[PDB]
Each structure stands twice: as structure tokens, then as C-alpha cells.
Amino acid sequence: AEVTQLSNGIVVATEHNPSAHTASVGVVFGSGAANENPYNNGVSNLWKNIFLSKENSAVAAKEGLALSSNISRDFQSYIVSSLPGSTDKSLDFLNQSFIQQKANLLSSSNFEATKKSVLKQVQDFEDNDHPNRVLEHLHSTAFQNTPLSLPTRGTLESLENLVVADLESFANNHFLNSNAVVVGTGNIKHEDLVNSIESKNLSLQTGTKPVLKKKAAFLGSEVRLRDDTLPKAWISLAVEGEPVNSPNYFVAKLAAQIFGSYNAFEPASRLQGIKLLDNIQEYQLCDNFNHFSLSYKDSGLWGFSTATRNVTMIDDLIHFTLKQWNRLTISVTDTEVERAKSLLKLQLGQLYESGNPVNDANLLGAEVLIKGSKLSLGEAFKKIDAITVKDVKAWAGKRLWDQDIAIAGTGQIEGLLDYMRIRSDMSMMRW
Amino acid sequence: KSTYRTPNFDDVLKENNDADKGRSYAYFMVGAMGLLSSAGAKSTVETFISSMTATADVLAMA
Amino acid sequence: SSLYKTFFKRNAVFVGTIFAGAFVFQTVFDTAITSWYENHNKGKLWKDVKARIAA
Numbered sequence: 001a002e003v004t005q006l007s008n009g010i011v012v013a014t015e016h017n018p019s020a021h022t023a024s025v026g027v028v029f030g031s032g033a034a035n036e037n038p039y040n041n042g043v044s045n046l047w048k049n050i051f052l053s054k055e056n057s058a059v060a061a062k063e064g065l066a067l068s069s070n071i072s073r074d075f076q077s078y079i080v081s082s083l084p085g086s087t088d089k090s091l092d093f094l095n096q097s098f099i100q101q102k103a104n105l106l107s108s109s110n111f112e113a114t115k116k117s118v119l120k121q122v123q124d125f126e127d128n129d130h131p132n133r134v135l136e137h138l139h140s141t142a143f144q145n146t147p148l149s150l151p152t153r154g155t156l157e158s159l160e161n162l163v164v165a166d167l168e169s170f171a172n173n174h175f176l177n178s179n180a181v182v183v184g185t186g187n188i189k190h191e192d193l194v195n196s197i198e199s200k201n202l203s204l205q206t207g208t209k210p211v212l213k214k215k216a217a218f219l220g221s222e223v224r225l226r227d228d229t230l231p232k233a234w235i236s237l238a239v240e241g242e243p244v245n246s247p248n249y250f251v252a253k254l255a256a257q258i259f260g261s262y263n264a265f266e267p268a269s270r271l272q273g274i275k276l277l278d279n280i281q282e283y284q285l286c287d288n289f290n291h292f293s294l295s296y297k298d299s300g301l302w303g304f305s306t307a308t309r310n311v312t313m314i315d316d317l318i319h320f321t322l323k324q325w326n327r328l329t330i331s332v333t334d335t336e337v338e339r340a341k342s343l344l345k346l347q348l349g350q351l352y353e354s355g356n357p358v359n360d361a362n363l364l365g366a367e368v369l370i371k372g373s374k375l376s377l378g379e380a381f382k383k384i385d386a387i388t389v390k391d392v393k394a395w396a397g398k399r400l401w402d403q404d405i406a407i408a409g410t411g412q413i414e415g416l417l418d419y420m421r422i423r424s425d426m427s428m429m430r431w
Numbered sequence: 432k433s434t435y436r437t438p439n440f441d442d443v444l445k446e447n448n449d450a451d452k453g454r455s456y457a458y459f460m461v462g463a464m465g466l467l468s469s470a471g472a473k474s475t476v477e478t479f480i481s482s483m484t485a486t487a488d489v490l491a492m493a
Numbered sequence: 494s495s496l497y498k499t500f501f502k503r504n505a506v507f508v509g510t511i512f513a514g515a516f517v518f519q520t521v522f523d524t525a526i527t528s529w530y531e532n533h534n535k536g537k538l539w540k541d542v543k544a545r546i547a548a
Contacts (some may be wrong), residue, residue, distance in 0.1 A: 038436065137434065144437040153432040217447070225434060402504065431509050455497035462506035469515040470522075 002366070003374040004190040008297045009203065010177060011369045012194050014184040023186025024357035025090040025193070026068075026079030027098070028365030030181070031174040031210060033154070034073045034147040034296070039161075042122070042154015043170045046162060049121075050105050050114050051097065053077055060093050068358050071152050073139075074297045075366050076174075077183075079358055087188045091196055098175070100206060101353060106164050118353045119160060130234045132227070134408050135305060138236040141223040142301060142406035146216045168356075177203065179210045181369055185360040209327025216298040220417055230411035232287070233311055236255040237318070237407045237422070238303025239399055241405045245371050250344075250383050251395045252293040252302055255328060255345070257340040259304065259321075261290035273339050275327075285310055286317050297370055301398060301406070314415035322425035329397035330428075337389050345381055352377045402427040 005013040033044055048069040050056070057067055066081040080090040085096075097105065126133055135201035136151045143149040184193045218240035242252040259276055263269045264287050270277065280286060308317060352363060367374040403426055409416055416422075445452060531538060 140435045141437060148436070149435075151435050153433050157433050220446075223434065223437070430507060451498060451503050454503060455494045459494070459497055459499065459506045462501075462511065465506065465508070465511045466514050466518065469511055470518050473515060473519065481522075 001376065001378070003376060005065040005368060005373060006190070006194060008194070008198050009206075010197065011181045011368070012184075012190070012197060013181055013364060013374075014193055015191045015359075015374075016187060016189055017185075017360075018187050020187045020357060021084075022081055022333055022357055023084050023087050023088065023090075023184070024079055024081045024183045024361050025094065025186075025188075025190045026077055026170055026182070026361055026365070027094065027367060028075055028077040028181050028183050028361070030075055030179045030369045032072045032074050032076045033150045033152045034216070035174060035210070035213070036150050036154075036170075038150070039158055040166050040170065041117070041150050041158040043162060043166055044076050045122075045153050046115070046118055046159070047071075047076075047167060047171070048078075049118050050167075053105065053114055055110055056097060056101070056105055063089055063093065063248075065090055065093055070362055072366070073148060073150075073152065074231050075364055075369055077362060079361055080181075080185075081282045081358060083421065084187050087192065088196055089117070095200065099202075102171070106167060108164070111164055111167075114394055115159070115162070118153075119156065120342065122156055122159060122253075125153060126156070127311050129229065130232075130410055131305060131307060134234045134236050134410050135311075137223050137225065137410075138238060138303075138305075138406060138408040141221045141408060142218055142238065142240075142351075143216055143299070144148070144218075144221065147213060148216045148296060148299060154409075163379055169354060172205070174210050176210060177206050178206050178208070181365055183361045183365040183368075187366060192268075194363075204395055216296075218299060218301075218404075218406070220423070221329075221405060222407035224413060224416070225410035226413050227410055228412055228414070232309050233308055233314055233409060233411040233416065234305070234307045234412045235314075235318075235409035235413065235416060236303065236305040237405055238294075238301040239405055239426075241293055241300030241302035241399070242295050243297060243299050244297070244367075246300075246397050248391075249295060250296075250380070251387055251391050252399070253348075254337070254340045254344050254384065255392055255395065256291040256293040256304075256386055257344045258328070258332065259291045259324060260343065261288070262286075263288045266292070273336075275336075276320060276324040280317065280359055280367065283310065283313060283316070285313055285320070290322070300327065311415050314413070315417050315421075318416070318422060321427060322422070324429075325400055326426075326428050328349065329401045332392055334389055337387065337392060341384055341387065344384055348380060348384075370384070 003013075003015055007009065031044075033041070048071050048370065050068050053065050060067055060080065062127060064082065064086060068079040068081065070077050070079075078094075080093055084088045103367060136153075140149050157419060178263070182193075182197060242249050244270075258274075260272065260274055261269075261271070262274070262277065262280075264281075270281060286306050286308040289304055291304040294301045304321065306317065308314065308322075310317070312355070351359075364374055405426060406417065407416075407422065531540075535541065
């Protein structure tokens with residue numbers, strides 16, 4: 001329940017939990033796919049893949065350490081998990097790979113075998129993971145010609161034309177000290193870790209700052225990846241959401257909980273206290289849907305994603321869903337808000353407190369990099385419970401009502417009507 | 432070509448310094464069209480309705 | 494045009510306001526046209542001819 005963080009030469013952030021059997025240690029850099037270019041796009045993902053290379057991974061396996069990495073938009077992270085006792089040997093492997101082997105991982109035999117793996121990896125994604133593929137393209141069109149548009153896994157064309165020098169160039173511009181935070185989760189104490197860190201000196205590229213860019217911006221638009229050979233239609237639609245560290249950060253997430261997620265095959269899901277379900281179940285407008293409030297450093301996306309085999313009624317799916325969202329500005333009820341608060345706490349809890357320290361590190365790391373600290377789970381609940389119907393209405397009237405949208409879809413989307421028809425539904429006629 | 436590489440719309444996109452620029456123009460046009468139409472419809476209806484009122488030749492003051 | 498955002502603030506003009514504006518327009522517009530028309534035809538009108546008559 002304690003979020004301890006101190007700075008000496010490097011910023012150290014930890015969160016202890018004695019009941020945890022293992023401990024995870026790692027470095028989280030304040031730069032991700034949002035820092036790349038259209039041409040070196042996929043370099044971060046490539047780094048992650050060599051860090052988990054058979055060679056580097058075997059060295060950690062002998063020592064009894066497990067490797068894990070995650071490439072996001074605003075950040076990047078390299079994590080090593082171990083037993084509570086080997087909390088020192090994780091730091092040896094961390095330093096040995098980011099300073100000593102910052103040239104042994106980049107061999108012309110390791111790099112090629114890895115490049116061939118991320119190529120089959122990113123290709124498999126585009127060929128089969130339609131829901132995530134669609135969600136990735138949603139960011140692509142919504143934030144076109146802006147940092148948030150670049151996909152995390154990179155594109156096949158920028159990937160196959162990438163070389164060892166590109167990795168180095170990126171590493172020497174972002175893997176800096178002022179653009180880093182060392183994180184530790186599990187059971188180890190803050191004072192326990194900071195000592196092993198403040199022990200080993202050496203700055204290594206100190207005072208150096210990463211390159212700057214241009215601010216991210218939402219552009220109402222769409223990308224339609226029609227493919228009549230797929231057995232379904234997958235669509236994602238959203239408005240400009242909230243950036244992390246926004247006053248309405250929670251109002252937005254609550255609003256998404258009101259409509260929540262659905263799965264037509266799960267008996268219990270068909271019974272949720274969601275008004276939209278009365279409309280969509282009559283003719284079974286979809287197999288599933290899920291709302292989200294994605295937040296990043298400069299912006300975010302608020303909307304929903306859905307999958308359906310009812311290809312001749314896609315317009316009803318979109319129409320009923322948008323009519324429900326209209327409600328947030330004009331008629332959302334106290335009980336809908338209250339139901340959302342309870343369910344938001346339950347999901348926010350299950351995230352911030354899972355039985356896995358690697359998840360804790362990513363959540364902690366990502367937060368401290370943006371606001372310099374982490375809001376305690378109990379602090380969130382105070383903010384969540386304080387939200388009134390009046391708040392949700394003021395938010396919706398600014399973010400949802402008669403606002404541009406961004407759309408992306410693949411599969412049998414002939415039935416997804418034109419942009420203007422969808423856009424017109426972002427409001428209602430009144431006297 | 433990669434689908435993630437969105438084609439160029441620079442020639443069409445407005446250099447967004449005034450966010451609600453196109454919206455204000457569109458809504459003014461839509462609003463003015465709605466105004467002149469309503470006045471037109473009103474005038475058309477009155478023209479037809481008044482054709483049924485007593486004709487000039489039948490208003491004899493006996 | 495910020496002149497629009499002062500009166501209607503990013504929202505479209507509502508029918509009630511449209512109908513109300515139409516009734517106003519009808520009267521104003523008619524007077525403006527009748528005025529111009531009668532002035533443009535000064536001297537030819539019966540009003541003008543009656544002024545030069547006394548019986």
C-alpha cells in the first residue's frame with residue numbers, strides 16, 4: 001500500500017508487499033513507439049526481442065532469473081523476475097546487459113535470427129489478430145501524422161529495412177538516465193534496493209536529453225480495411241479521450257464502465273445492468289463489444305470496439321450504441337453512475353493488485369514517469385466515489401456531444417455506413 | 432504499401448488554429464437555409480390559403 | 494467565426510429559434526422591399542398622382 005520513490009543520481013521507485021513469493025526488478029524508459037519515426041518504426045519492439053533472445057535469456061535462466069519486456073506508446077520496459085533472495089543478482093544481469101553487453105547482444109548472427117522472428121511475429125498479427133489489428137489502426141487514423149499514430153510492433157516495411165545502427169542510434173538517444181526510472185516490485189524494501197544501486201557508481205551518458213517533437217492531435221477520420229473473406233466484422237470507434245493526469249481521467253473511465261463490455265455467449269453477461277443490452281439482444285447485433293478509456297501522455301481515446309456476424313444489421317449496432325452514448329449528456333441516471341462506480345473499483349482493484357509483480361512494475365513505472373508519483377488505490381476510490389451525474393454530463397457534453405469520431409474496421413464491413421451517418425448520431429434533434 | 436501509413440490530406444486539411452472554424456460556417460449556413468425555408472414555406476402556405484378567402488367581386492356592400 | 498460561438502456556442506441553431514427568426518424576417522424583409530420598390534418608382538405611383546390632384 002506504500003509508494004516509495006527517491007532520487008540520488010537515478011530515480012528509484014518501489015512498492016513492497018511481503019506476502020509476495022517473488023520480486024521483480026527492471027528499468028522503465030520514458031520513451032516508446034510514440035518517440036519513433038515512420039521510418040525506424042519498430043526499433044523499440046526489436047530491442048525488446050533481443051533482450052529476450054535465446055542467448056541473453058539462457059544466461060538469466062542458469063542464474064534462475066526470468067525475463068520480461070513491454071513496448072508501449074509513451075514508455076518502454078525491461079524486467080527481470082527472481083526470488084526475494086536473489087534481488088541482487090537481478091541488478092547484475094540488468095547492468096551486464098545495458099552496459100557490458102550493449103554490444104554483445106547486437107551481433108550479426110543474433111540480430112538476423114531475431115529480425116526474422118519479429119517479422120514472422122508482426123506478420124502473424126496483421127494476418128490474424130483482427131480485433132487488436134483494428135484497434136491499432138484506430139490509433140493510426142485518429143492520430144495520423146502525429147506520435148500516437150505509430151503502431152507499437154512497428155510496420156513490416158520499416159522493420160525489414162532496419163539495421164544494427166538504428167538500434168544503437170535509438171538506444172543512445174532514449175536509453176538515457178534522465179529518461180529512465182528503475183522500478184522494483186515484489187517484496188523487497190525500498191532501502192534494500194536503493195543501496196545496491198547507490199553502491200555501484202558510474203553515470204554513463206549523464207546530462208544527455210532525448211530529442212523533442214510535435215504535440216499529438218486527434219483528427220476525426222476513418223480507415224476501412226474491408227475483407228469479405230473474413231467471417232465477421234470487427235470495428236472500433238472513438239472520440240478524443242483524456243490524457244493521463246487529466247481532471248476528468250476518472251470521469252472518462254467511469255463513463256466507459258456504464259456501457260462496459262459484453263459477450264453474447266456468456267449467460268451472466270446478457271444479464272448486466274446495461275440499457276444498451278435491451279436493444280442489441282433482440283436481433284443479436286453482435287457477438288461482443290467493450291468500451292474503453294485509453295489514456296496517454298498527450299491525449300487519449302474514448303469509445304468502443306465490437307465484433308459481429310450479423311453483417312446486414314451493423315447499422316443498428318452502431319445506431320443503438322451511439323444513442324446510448326447520447327444519454328450521458330442528457331439523461332444518465334443516478335443508479336447507472338452508482339453501478340459504474342462499484343464496477344470501476346472492482347476492475348481498478350483487480351489491475352493494481354494482481355498476483356503478479358511484473359504487472360505491478362509496468363503500472364508503477366508508467367505512472368511515475370509521467371507525474372513523478374503514483375496515486376494510491378485508496379486515493380483513486382475517493383475520487384471515483386466523488387463523481388456526480390452532473391460531472392458525467394459536463395464531461396460528455398464536451399467530449400461526446402456533436403464531436404468528431406475516428407473509425408476503423410476490417411472483415412465484412414459493407415454494412416458499416418458512411419462517416420457522416422455515424423457522425424450525425426453523435427447527437428439528437430431538439431426543439 | 433503499409434495500411435498504417437495514412438495518405439496525404441494536407442491539401443484538404445485546414446491548419447487547425449481555430450478548431451471550430453468549419454463547424455461555425457456549416458452551422459451558420461445550415462441555420463440560414465433553415466430560416467429562409469421556413470419563411471418561404473409560410474409564405475407559400477398563406478398564398479394558397481388566402482386564395483380561398485372571399486373574392487374581390489363578391490364583397491358587395493348592400 | 495467567433496461571432497457564432499457567442500450566440501449558439503458550437504451547437505447548431507434549433508428549430509424554435511429558426512421559426513422565431515423566420516416570423517421576424519418576414520416582416521422586416523417585406524418593409525425593406527416595399528420601401529425600395531416604391532422609392533424606385535417615385536412619380537409613377539397612384540400616391541404621387543393623387544398629390545397632384547384636387548377635386
